[PDB]
Each structure stands twice: as C-alpha cells, then as structure tokens.
C-alpha cells in the first residue's frame, strides 16, 4: 500500500521534529551544567 | 547548584520518556514494513 | 550535593541506553526495507 | 512501494543524522560532568 508507506512517511517527519527537540533540550541542559563548573 | 541539578534531573526524566516513545514509534514502523514484506 | 549529581549521572547513562535502542530500531527498519528493495 | 520507498529511505537516513546529534549532545554533557567532578575534587581536597 502506498497509503501505508505514506503513513510511515508522515510518522517519520514527526519523529524527526521530536528528535530535534530532544537534542535542543539536551543542549540547554549542557549549558546548565557548564554554568556549575566554577559556579 | 543543588536547585539547578534538581531541575536538570526532572528534565532528564521527561527526555527519557520522549526517547522511549520515539523508539516505540520506530518499532511500530518496523512492523508495518514487515507486513508489506510478508505480503 | 553528591546525591543529586549521582542521580543525574545515572539518568544520563539511562538516556545513553535508551538512545542506543532508537539507533538499533532504525537499523532494523533499514534491514526490513532492504528486503522490500529486492521485490518492491 | 518504490518512489514512495525511496522517500522513506531518505527519511530514515535523515533520522539517523538527527539521532547522531542527540548522541553527540549526550557526549558533550558527560564531558561537562567530568569537568564538574574535577572542580568538585580540587575545590574540596
């Protein structure tokens, strides 16, 4: 089915954005931990 | 420091859930592909 | 404190493990796709 | 399941690169954690 594959596609686009958000949150966390080095 | 760490910790709990959810969506995608292959 | 940092460190190791499952699932989809390539 | 399949392959590849960013970020975090242990040690005894 090209509809099934179309569905997989749509889910993959969403997972891409979800992973990009996880990355961004981890980068933020990284900065927080950096602060604490001398602080 | 202890306050910041608690905020980081809480965030890491939510990221774990988000990652595990992504993994789950991928395993379901894997199922869909397998079903097409079976066909 | 020591305790909170330890809990954070453990959490980061769990995310390492969780992310490796994501990577492994991706790899398994690729394998399943390759099977289609042959026929599909 | 051909042109569509190729689209899916492109997406799975993109997702692989996205995940690599996530793993790199985790690696950098750990590096900052080790720096934080260095400090904590030196600033104590």
JSON list of C-alpha atoms in Angstrom, two decimals, chain C residues 6-33:
[
{"chain": "C", "resi": 6, "resn": "UNK", "atom": "CA", "xyz": [24.82, 10.94, 41.16]},
{"chain": "C", "resi": 7, "resn": "UNK", "atom": "CA", "xyz": [21.12, 10.69, 40.22]},
{"chain": "C", "resi": 8, "resn": "UNK", "atom": "CA", "xyz": [21.77, 12.99, 37.24]},
{"chain": "C", "resi": 9, "resn": "UNK", "atom": "CA", "xyz": [24.75, 10.89, 36.12]},
{"chain": "C", "resi": 10, "resn": "UNK", "atom": "CA", "xyz": [22.65, 7.74, 36.32]},
{"chain": "C", "resi": 11, "resn": "UNK", "atom": "CA", "xyz": [19.88, 9.38, 34.30]},
{"chain": "C", "resi": 12, "resn": "UNK", "atom": "CA", "xyz": [22.32, 10.35, 31.57]},
{"chain": "C", "resi": 13, "resn": "UNK", "atom": "CA", "xyz": [23.52, 6.73, 31.36]},
{"chain": "C", "resi": 14, "resn": "UNK", "atom": "CA", "xyz": [19.91, 5.53, 31.03]},
{"chain": "C", "resi": 15, "resn": "UNK", "atom": "CA", "xyz": [19.40, 8.02, 28.14]},
{"chain": "C", "resi": 16, "resn": "UNK", "atom": "CA", "xyz": [22.55, 6.59, 26.56]},
{"chain": "C", "resi": 17, "resn": "UNK", "atom": "CA", "xyz": [20.96, 3.13, 26.77]},
{"chain": "C", "resi": 18, "resn": "UNK", "atom": "CA", "xyz": [17.55, 4.35, 25.54]},
{"chain": "C", "resi": 19, "resn": "UNK", "atom": "CA", "xyz": [19.12, 6.16, 22.55]},
{"chain": "C", "resi": 20, "resn": "UNK", "atom": "CA", "xyz": [21.02, 3.00, 21.60]},
{"chain": "C", "resi": 21, "resn": "UNK", "atom": "CA", "xyz": [17.62, 1.27, 21.35]},
{"chain": "C", "resi": 22, "resn": "UNK", "atom": "CA", "xyz": [16.49, 4.05, 18.97]},
{"chain": "C", "resi": 23, "resn": "UNK", "atom": "CA", "xyz": [19.60, 3.54, 16.86]},
{"chain": "C", "resi": 24, "resn": "UNK", "atom": "CA", "xyz": [19.09, -0.24, 16.88]},
{"chain": "C", "resi": 25, "resn": "UNK", "atom": "CA", "xyz": [15.42, 0.02, 15.83]},
{"chain": "C", "resi": 26, "resn": "UNK", "atom": "CA", "xyz": [16.44, 2.35, 12.97]},
{"chain": "C", "resi": 27, "resn": "UNK", "atom": "CA", "xyz": [18.97, -0.24, 11.84]},
{"chain": "C", "resi": 28, "resn": "UNK", "atom": "CA", "xyz": [16.27, -2.96, 11.98]},
{"chain": "C", "resi": 29, "resn": "UNK", "atom": "CA", "xyz": [13.92, -0.87, 9.80]},
{"chain": "C", "resi": 30, "resn": "UNK", "atom": "CA", "xyz": [16.74, -0.48, 7.27]},
{"chain": "C", "resi": 31, "resn": "UNK", "atom": "CA", "xyz": [17.15, -4.27, 7.16]},
{"chain": "C", "resi": 32, "resn": "UNK", "atom": "CA", "xyz": [13.40, -4.75, 6.66]},
{"chain": "C", "resi": 33, "resn": "UNK", "atom": "CA", "xyz": [13.45, -2.10, 3.89]}
]
